[PDB]
Amino acid sequence: MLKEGAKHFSGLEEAVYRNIQACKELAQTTRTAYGPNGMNKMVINHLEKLFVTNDAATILRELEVQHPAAKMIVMASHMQEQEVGDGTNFVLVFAGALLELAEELLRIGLSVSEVIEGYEIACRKAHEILPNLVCCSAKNLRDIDEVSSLLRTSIMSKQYGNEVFLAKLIAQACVSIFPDSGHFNVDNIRVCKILGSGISSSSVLHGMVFKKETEGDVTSVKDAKIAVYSCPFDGMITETKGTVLIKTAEELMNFSKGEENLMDAQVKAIADTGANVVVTGGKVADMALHYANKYNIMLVRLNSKWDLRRLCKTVGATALPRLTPPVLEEMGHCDSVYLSEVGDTQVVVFKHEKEDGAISTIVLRGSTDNLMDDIERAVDDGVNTFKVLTRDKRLVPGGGATEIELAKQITSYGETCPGLEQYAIKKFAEAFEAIPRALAENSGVKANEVISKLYAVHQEGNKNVGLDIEAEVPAVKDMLEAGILDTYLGKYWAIKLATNAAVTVLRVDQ
Amino acid sequence: TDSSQGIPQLVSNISACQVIAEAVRTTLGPRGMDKLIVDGRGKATISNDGATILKLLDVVHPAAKTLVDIAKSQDAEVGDGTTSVTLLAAEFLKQVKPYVEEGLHPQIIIRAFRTATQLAVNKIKEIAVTVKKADKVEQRKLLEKCAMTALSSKLISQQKAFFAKMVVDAVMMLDDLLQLKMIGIKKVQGGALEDSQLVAGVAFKKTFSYAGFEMQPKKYHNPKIALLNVELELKAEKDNAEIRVHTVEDYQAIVDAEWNILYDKLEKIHHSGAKVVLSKLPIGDVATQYFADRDMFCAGRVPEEDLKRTMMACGGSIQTSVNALSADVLGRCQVFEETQIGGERYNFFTGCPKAKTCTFILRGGAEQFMEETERSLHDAIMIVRRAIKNDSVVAGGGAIEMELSKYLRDYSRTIPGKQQLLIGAYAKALEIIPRQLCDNAGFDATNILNKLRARHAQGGTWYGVDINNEDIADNFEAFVWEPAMVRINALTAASEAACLIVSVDETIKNPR
Amino acid sequence: EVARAQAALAVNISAARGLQDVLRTNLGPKGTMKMLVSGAGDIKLTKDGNVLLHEMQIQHPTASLIAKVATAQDDITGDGTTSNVLIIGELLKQADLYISEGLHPRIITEGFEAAKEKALQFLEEVKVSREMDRETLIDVARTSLRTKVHAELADVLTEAVVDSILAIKKQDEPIDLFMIEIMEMKHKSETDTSLIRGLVLDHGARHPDMKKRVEDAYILTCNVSLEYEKTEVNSGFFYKSAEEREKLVKAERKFIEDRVKKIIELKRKVCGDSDKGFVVINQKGIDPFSLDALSKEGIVALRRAKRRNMERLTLACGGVALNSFDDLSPDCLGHAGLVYEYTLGEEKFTFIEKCNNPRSVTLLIKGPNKHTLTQIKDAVRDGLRAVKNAIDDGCVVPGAGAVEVAMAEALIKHKPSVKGRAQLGVQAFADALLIIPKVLAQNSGFDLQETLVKIQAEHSESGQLVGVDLNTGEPMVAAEVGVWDNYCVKKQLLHSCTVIATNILLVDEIMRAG
C-alpha cells in the first residue's frame, strides 16, 4: 500500500470499487437472461461454430479477468450449475445487482463487517421462509407435465420458444428411466447430435445413439463384447500409385497380403476377442470391413471421442489402437446393439434398458450444433434441474414468481430488525427485481413498472414477468399456476450461493 | 477472449452484413459495375451472382458470416435466392439500426420479424399458381416459357425461345435435381446460333490429337470406355535408360523393355476389356504410339466434368490407373462417335447402359451469344428444373414484393407499438429488391414503386416492375415465372436471417 | 545510492502502515479475509498478520524484514501477528513524531526499556490465571478463530480444535505436534470440520474397497513390495541388452507373490477371519493382483499412505512398521476399532480410527479443497497454536484490547520511572499499545478516544479487564466474553515489536550494498 513493493489486485478503493464493479458487469448476460428471453450472446471460442448462448456457465468459461472476486466468483456460479442447471442465469445478476447495493452503503460508509451480514441474515430469512413459499412438487417423473413443468421454467429461463416441445421431449425422454431414487446420469441419457431433420424431429432414442455409421453388419448378439478401438483399422500397409498412372503392376499385391492376413488375424482376433461390435475410433479398411462382416462383428467406421468417451464410460471400454490381434478389456455393458436410422440417418445404436446404468438417449436433430448445443444447453439445464435426487422437486412458483413473495417478506423483515443490517436486509429485499427486470428488459419494461404493480399484488405467488407482451405492460405472467415451475433446490442454492460469493469478496483487500 | 456489448456492437454488425448486399444490390439482373477481384492468392475472382464472391469473402464477424451462410443456406438449394436473402435480412438489419437507437432492443426485437413473415407466405400460397403437363402447357411449354422466362429475361435472341424447348430436353431426361450436375452443357464454338444440340449422354467437346490420332478410331458403336483420371505419356513411363556395350545389340533393348511397358500399361486395360480409353490428363507420343498400336480409342486431357458425368452416363467408373482395372470400371455407351465440331474433336457418348448424363449442347458459331445464354441456361436450369419441382409458380419482379409490402404497409395500421417500425421496414424490404431492377429497367425505383403501390391499390394480381419487360405490370402474365416455393424459402430466411444477431448485442470472440 | 538520516528513517515509518492498513481490515472478527491472486501469483485467501506477508512477494526493503518477526510469533501464537504489526508502526509513528520534534533514536529507545518492562511487568501484573478447560479453551480457540474467521466457523473450527487439544493432553504434550492433523476432504461444503480419533488414510488401494469397513484393525504398515514392479527392467532399468530385461521381471512379480502368499499365510496367521481386519498398508504402491488376491479374502491392502501415515499408523494405532510380511500375529500389529475406506469426493479416504494408544487423532475438514478450505485450515492450526499456548500457559488474559487500557493506561498514567528520559520512549511505547483496542473499535465506526476513554476509565473505574466488541467497536468486558489473550501469545509480540522496532529506528541511513 505505502510500499513500492508487495502485491495486490484488490484492496482499498479497489475492494470497495473494482471487486464490486466488474463482478456486477459480469451480470450483463444474466441481466438479459434467466427467464424467457430472445436476447442471446454470440460467444466465439473459435470452433467454427459461432455459439449463441445465454448460459452463464459457458459464457463465463471464456471470460477471464484480473478481479480476484470476478476471477473467483464464477466458481460459485459454476458450482451452482453443478447443483442445478437452471437458476444459473439467475445467480450472476442477482448478487451482481445485490453487490453495488452494499457499495452504495459503502458510499454511505456502511461497513463490510456490517452490510453483507444483513444479506447473509436475510439469506437465512429467505431460506428460512423460502421453503414456506414452495407450492407444488414434481412427483411422478415418468409423467410428462410434472417433469416438463419444471423444465418449463428451466429451458424457458435459458431460451423461450423452443422450450415447450423440449420440455415434452425431455419428459418424453423419461430421464425417470433413472428412477431418480438418488439416481441420475448425464452420459447414459445423452444428447446425440444429428444434422438436419427438425429439432421438433429431435427425439430420444434409448440406448447409446451414435450418428457415426454402423459399417457392414450389425452385432452378432445384442449383449455384445463391444470392441471400442481408437485405431483398430488404420490400414496395415497401404497401396500406392507411382507414375500418376500406376507404380508397378507387380508391387500391388504384397501390401494387401500384409493388410488382409493381418486384418484377417486382426479381425479374426476381433472375433477371437469375441467382439460382437467393433467400434473404430479411427477409420476402417475395406478388408477389415470384409473381415468384420465375415467374422460377424458389427463395425463402426469412425468414432469421435463422443462415442469413445461414453463408450469407455458406459461399456467399461478403453478405446485402443490395433495393428495386432486384440483383446477386449472393453467387453460390453450393452444388452442391445443396432444400426438404426435415427435422425433418419444410419446410426450406431448401442442399447439396453435398466434403472441403473440404463442408456436412454436423447437424439437431437438439427441443421447445426449451434442449434443442437445451445438448445441442448437450454435443454439440459432443465435435464440438470431434473436432477435433484429428491424426487419431488418442491416446485416453488416458477418464472421467479417467488420474487414478489420473498420481496415483501424480506422488506417487512428488514423493517423489523434495527441497525445497519435492516438496510442490508431491505437491500436484500431489493435484488429480487433483477430477473423480473432481466425479464422486463428482454421484455422491454422497467422492473419498477413490473414490480410496483407486483407490489400491488402483494402476496400473489403466481404473477411474474418473462419475455412476452404480458411481461411488458401487464407486468404479469402467471408463473406459479402456469405449466412453468421451478424446484426449491435451485432456490436453496442461488440465493445462498450468489451470497456465498458476495460474502467475502468485499472483504478481500489484497 | 473479446466482446463488445450493447447496441455499439449490434449496430456494428449490420454494415459488415450490409456492405456485401451493397454489392449484390442488383447482381441478379446483372447491370451495374463489376470489378474483377484479385485476392491475395493472385486469383482473379468474379461471379454470376453475389454468392460466389460471398464464398470468396470471409469475416471474423459471426454476424457478417451468418447471413453469408444464410444466403449460402439459400444459395445451394435453388442455386439462387442468395442476393434476395443477402439484401432483405441485411435491409431489416439496415433499417432497424435507426430503430435500434430509438431501440427495438427488447425482444419485441424478434417477434414481428417472423410474425409478419408468415403473413407473406400466408399471401404466397393463396396467390400461388400451379402448372402441369396438360395445364396451360406441356410443362415443357412451361419450361419453354419458364426458360423463355429465365433465358430471355436478361436480350440474346429467339434461340432463347428455341433453346426454351431445347434446354428442357436434357432437363426432362434427367429431371430429379434442381441443377445440372447430371446434365451439364457443352459449349460449341462453330456451327451457328440457330442450331444448338443435345446429347442423351456426355459428349466431349474435344479430345486431343496425337501421333496416330487420325489412325485411331473416332467411332465406336460399342465403346468400352476406360475413364481415366490419369495420363499415359512418354513422361509417364520413361523411355530413357542405358546398358553396357562391348556389343551394341543392347541399345535396341534397354529402351525397348521400357517401351514394352508403356505398351503393356495402356494395353492391359485394352487387352482386358477396353476399346475406348478416355484420360483427363496428357497422352504423349510413345504412349499414344502404343495407343496408335492399339487402335482402340485413346484420349487424354479431356474434361473430367464430362468424364465423371461419363461415369454417370456410362456406368463405368473414373479410373485412377490404366491397370488393376476391370472391364466394368470401363465406361460404356452404344455410341462412341467423334465428329469434330469446329476445333472441338467431338465425342458422341450415347446409348449408355444408364445415361445418368444427358447434356444440352449449346452451339453458337460465335462466343458471345452462347455464354450469355449459357448464363441464361443456369437461369433456365435453376428455374425450369424448379419449375417442375414446385409446379406452384409465384412471380418475381416486385409482383408480390410490391403487393406484400402493399398490405405490409397496410398491416402497419393495426400494429402500433415498437414493432410497427419493423412492419414498415419489413414491408419496403420486399420493395427494395425491385428498387434496383427498376434502375435495371431504367426506371426510378420509388415513383415506379409508388405507382406499383397505386398499381396495387388498382391491381395487385401479379403487378410489379419487371426489368424483364422494363415495365410495370403483372409479372406472372409478363412471363416472370419462378415457383412460389423459393419465396417461403427466402422469406423463412428474410425475417429470420436478420433476427439472429439482433438477438445478440453482446458478441464474444476468443483466440482459441 | 544513499538516503540520509530522516530519508532512510522516512522509509521506515512509511512501509509500516500499509501492513497495519491491511490489519485494520485484517484484525479480529472485525478484520476481513484477504484474497491474494497477486501475492505469490497463486489464487489465495487469508486472514492473519503473519501469513498475508509471506504470501506476497514483497519488493520493499523495510517489508523484507517485516515477514520475519511475526513468523516466530505465529509459530507460538497464531494471533498477534495480526496485532504486533499494528503496534510497531504505531510506535514508528510516535518515534517519528519525537524525532520530528527532534531526538535521537537512542534516547527514544531508552524510554522503551522501563516502559517495555512495566508493561511486560504488567503482563505479570495483569496475568489472568484461567484454569485450562475445554470451555475456556473453546474461548481461547474461537477468539483466534473469530480473529481469523466467522464466529460461526470459529465455533465450527473450535470443536475440532478443542477436540484434539484434550487428546494431545491425552498424549501428555502441553504443546501440540500431533493431533495437529488437519485433513482436507473433498466435499461440496467446507462447512464440515470434524475429528477422526485415528488417521484418514490415503489410498485404500488402486483396486479399491478391498475390505472397506474394518471394525477391528490389525495394522501392518509396511514399506514392503506388493508392488515391486510388473514392468520391464533388467538391472532395475533399461540395459543395453534388450533380451536380458524380462528375465528378472517375473521374479519381480514373484517376489511380490512371495509377499502376497505370505499375506495369505499372514492374514491366516493374524486373522483367520474377515471379521477382525488384517490391514496391509504400503508406503509404495500395491499390485491390483496382490490386492485381488488379498481383497477377495477380506483383506484391505493400502498403498502409498505417506510416511506421516507410516508413523501415525505405527503410532496412532499402536501400530507397527514391519517390512517383511512373512508370518506375524495380530498383536505384532497395532489395532484400531474402525478402519473404513470412505469416498466423499473423488478419492476414497480410509479412516483408521478408534486407534488404540492414539498418537494421532485426525481433524477432518471437508470441502472444495480450495483456498477456502485452506482458509479454515490455517485458522484452526493458528487457533490450535493459540490453545496450544492456552494449554502451555495456565494464565490467559482477556483479548479485545482489554489488556492495554489496563496496560497502556497505567503507563499512560505514569512513566514507569516517572522521569522524562523514559517519557521519550514511554509516550511512544504506551501510545503504540492502544492501537489494537482502538483500531477495530474505530474500524467499526466508533471514534477511538470516545471508545478508549470508556474502556480506559471502565478499567480505571471498575479495575476491570474490559474488552472491545470488535465488530461493534464498543467497550465490552473481555474477561467474561472469551476473547482471551494467552500469556504466551501477548508476551512475544511485545518482544517481537521491540526487537524489530529498535535497530530500524537506530538505522538512519540506507545504501545499495552491491
3-state SS record for A352-376: CCCCCCCCEEEEEEECCHHHHHHHH
Grid cell 471421442 is found at A305
Please, are residues B131 and B391 in contact by the beta-carbon 8 Å criterion? yes
d(CA A454, CA A187): 42
Grid cell 428471453 is found at A37
d(CA C434, CA C436): 6
**CB neighbours of residue A493 within 10 Å:** 24
Note whether A63 contacts B265, CB cutoff 8 Å: no
Please, are residues A230 and A326 in contact by the beta-carbon 8 Å criterion? no
Kindly tell me the burial class for residue C441, based on how many C-beta atoms sit within 10 Å of its own C-beta (0-12, 13-18, 19 or more): buried
State the Cα torsion B436-B437-B440-B445 to the nearest 10°: -60
Please, are residues B179 and B385 in contact by the beta-carbon 8 Å criterion? yes
Note whether A66 contacts C60, CB cutoff 8 Å: no
d(CA A52, CA A372): 11
Number of helical H runs and strand E runs in chain B: 17, 20
Note whether C33 contacts A504, CB cutoff 8 Å: yes
Question: Catalytic: C451?
Answer: no
d(CA A383, CA A155): 9
Please, are residues A333 and A276 in contact by the beta-carbon 8 Å criterion? no
Note whether A2 contacts C18, CB cutoff 8 Å: yes
Question: Catalytic: C81?
Answer: yes
Question: Catalytic: B115?
Answer: no
- CA nearest B153: which of B394, B479, B482, B483? B479
Question: Catalytic: C292?
Answer: no
Choosing from C46, C62, C77, C81, the catalytic residue is: C81
Note whether C45 contacts A1, CB cutoff 8 Å: no
Please, are residues C372 and C331 in contact by the beta-carbon 8 Å criterion? no
The residues facing A209 across adjacent strands are A349
Helix (H, G, I), strand (E, B) or coil at C80: coil
Kindly tell me the burial class for residue B269, based on how many C-beta atoms sit within 10 Å of its own C-beta (0-12, 13-18, 19 or more): buried
d(CA B430, CA B92): 10
**CA–centroid distance for B353 within its chain:** 27
User: Which chain C residue lies closest to A509 (C-alpha atoms)?
Assistant: C34
Q: Is B329's Cβ below 8 Å from some Cβ in A?
A: no
d(CA C87, CA C81): 10
Q: Is A64's Cβ below 8 Å from some Cβ in B?
A: yes
Q: Give the list of residues 6+ apart from residue C8 with CB closer than 8 angstroms, or none.
A: C507, C508, C509, C510
The residues facing B232 across adjacent strands are B283
Kindly tell me the burial class for residue A303, based on how many C-beta atoms sit within 10 Å of its own C-beta (0-12, 13-18, 19 or more): buried
- CA nearest C95: which of C85, C106, C108, C107? C108
- CA nearest A63: which of C404, B510, B482? B510
Q: Spell out the SS3 assignment of A449-489.
A: HHHHHHHHCCCCCCECCCCCCCCCCCCCCECCCCCCEECHH
d(CA C365, CA C380): 10
d(CA C325, CA C280): 9
B110 CB neighbours in chain A (<8 A) are 38
Please, are residues B479 and B380 in contact by the beta-carbon 8 Å criterion? no
Choosing from B49, B306, B439, B474, the catalytic residue is: B49
Q: Is A253's Cβ below 8 Å from some Cβ in B?
A: no
Which residue among C35, C45, C56 places its CB closest to the CB of A6?
C56
Note whether A62 contacts B510, CB cutoff 8 Å: yes
C-to-N gaps above 2.5 Å in chain C, after residues: none
Mutate to test the interface with A, among B506, B507, B509 (most CBs of A within 10 A): B506
- CA nearest B156: which of B341, B358, B394, B362? B362
User: Which chain A residue lies closest to B110 (C-alpha atoms)?
Assistant: A38
d(CA B305, CA C209): 67
B511 CB neighbours in chain A (<8 A) are 46
User: Which chain B residue lies closest to A29 (C-alpha atoms)?
Assistant: B506
Please, are residues C31 and C462 in contact by the beta-carbon 8 Å criterion? no
**β-bridge pairing C362-367 and C348-355:** unpaired
**C79 annotated ligand-binding residue:** yes
Note whether C26 contacts A509, CB cutoff 8 Å: yes
Please, are residues B202 and B349 in contact by the beta-carbon 8 Å criterion? yes
State the Cα torsion A508-B3-B8-B9 to the nearest 10°: -160
Which residue among B5, B110, B320 places its CB closest to the CB of A38?
B110
Helix (H, G, I), strand (E, B) or coil at C231: coil
The residues facing A169 across adjacent strands are none
Which residue among C17, C37, C60 places its CB closest to the CB of A68?
C37
Helix (H, G, I), strand (E, B) or coil at B149: helix
Please, are residues C353 and C199 in contact by the beta-carbon 8 Å criterion? yes
**β-bridge pairing B471-474 and C2-3:** unpaired
Q: Give the list of residues 6+ apart from residue B302 with CB closer than 8 angstroms, or none.
A: B204, B206, B207, B208, B278, B279, B280, B347
d(CA C496, CA C474): 28
**C485 annotated ligand-binding residue:** yes
Exposed e or buried b per residue across B285-314, where buried means at least 16 C-beta atoms within 10 angstroms of its C-beta: ebbbbbbbbbebbbbbebbbebbbbbbbbb
Please, are residues B182 and B283 in contact by the beta-carbon 8 Å criterion? no
Helix (H, G, I), strand (E, B) or coil at C83: helix
Please, are residues C92 and C9 in contact by the beta-carbon 8 Å criterion? no
Shortest Cα distance from A466 to chain B (angstroms)? 11
**CA–centroid distance for A450 within its chain:** 30
B500 CB neighbours in chain A (<8 A) are 52
DSSP H helices in A208-342: 253-272, 286-294, 305-310
**CB neighbours of residue A131 within 10 Å:** 13
**C287 annotated ligand-binding residue:** no
Please, are residues C294 and C260 in contact by the beta-carbon 8 Å criterion? yes
Q: CA separation (Å) from B320 to B210, B237, B270?
A: 22, 16, 15
The residues facing C397 across adjacent strands are C485
d(CA C344, CA B164): 78
Note whether A443 contacts B232, CB cutoff 8 Å: no
**B326 annotated ligand-binding residue:** no
Note whether C443 contacts A111, CB cutoff 8 Å: yes
Q: Which grid cell sits at C164?
A: 484434539
- Rg of chain B over CA atoms, in angstroms? 28
Q: Which grid cell sits at A183?
A: 439416481
B59 CB neighbours in chain A (<8 A) are none
A and C touch per CB criterion (3+ pairs under 8 A): yes
Per the annotation, binding residues of A are 34-35, 86-90, 156-158, 399, 486, 491
Note whether C35 contacts A72, CB cutoff 8 Å: yes
Residue C146 phi/psi, 5° resolution? -55, -40
**CB neighbours of residue C54 within 10 Å:** 18
Note whether A472 contacts B265, CB cutoff 8 Å: no
Choosing from C48, C74, C155, C216, the catalytic residue is: C48
Shortest Cα distance from A294 to chain C (angstroms)? 37
Please, are residues A203 and A169 in contact by the beta-carbon 8 Å criterion? yes
Which residue among A7, A111, A507 places its CB closest to the CB of C38?
A7
The count of CB pairs under 8 A between chains A and B is: 102
The residues facing B130 across adjacent strands are B392
Q: Is A256's Cβ below 8 Å from some Cβ in B?
A: no
d(CA B165, CA B143): 7
B267 CB neighbours in chain A (<8 A) are none
d(CA B89, CA B405): 15
**B316 annotated ligand-binding residue:** no
User: Which chain B residue lies closest to A440 (C-alpha atoms)?
Assistant: B106
Shortest Cα distance from C30 to chain A (angstroms)? 6
**CB neighbours of residue C510 within 10 Å:** 17
DSSP A176: G
Mutate to test the interface with A, among C35, C44, C82, C373 (most CBs of A within 10 A): C35
Grid cell 417487512 is found at A412
Q: Give the list of residues 6+ apart from residue C165 with CB closer than 8 angstroms, or none.
A: C134, C137, C141, C176, C179, C384, C387, C388, C390, C391
**B25 annotated ligand-binding residue:** no
Shortest Cα distance from A28 to chain B (angstroms)? 9
**β-bridge pairing A51-53 and A41-44:** antiparallel
A399: left (phi over 0), alpha (psi -120 to 50) or beta: left
Choosing from B379, B391, B439, B474, the catalytic residue is: B379
Q: Which grid cell sits at A469?
A: 407482451
Upper half-sphere CA count for residue A486 (Cβ side, 13 Å): 36
- CA nearest C73: which of C510, C486, C507, C503? C486
Note whether A508 contacts C26, CB cutoff 8 Å: no
**Window B:1-20, CB contacts with A under 8 Å:** 1, 3, 5
User: Which chain A residue lies closest to B238 (C-alpha atoms)?
Assistant: A243
Please, are residues A321 and A230 in contact by the beta-carbon 8 Å criterion? yes
Amino acid, res. B252: Q
Q: Give the list of residues 6+ apart from residue A45 with CB closer than 8 angstroms, or none.
A: A51, A61, A62, B510, B512
Note whether B108 contacts A28, CB cutoff 8 Å: no
Shortest Cα distance from B370 to chain A (angstroms)? 36
Note whether B504 contacts A252, CB cutoff 8 Å: no
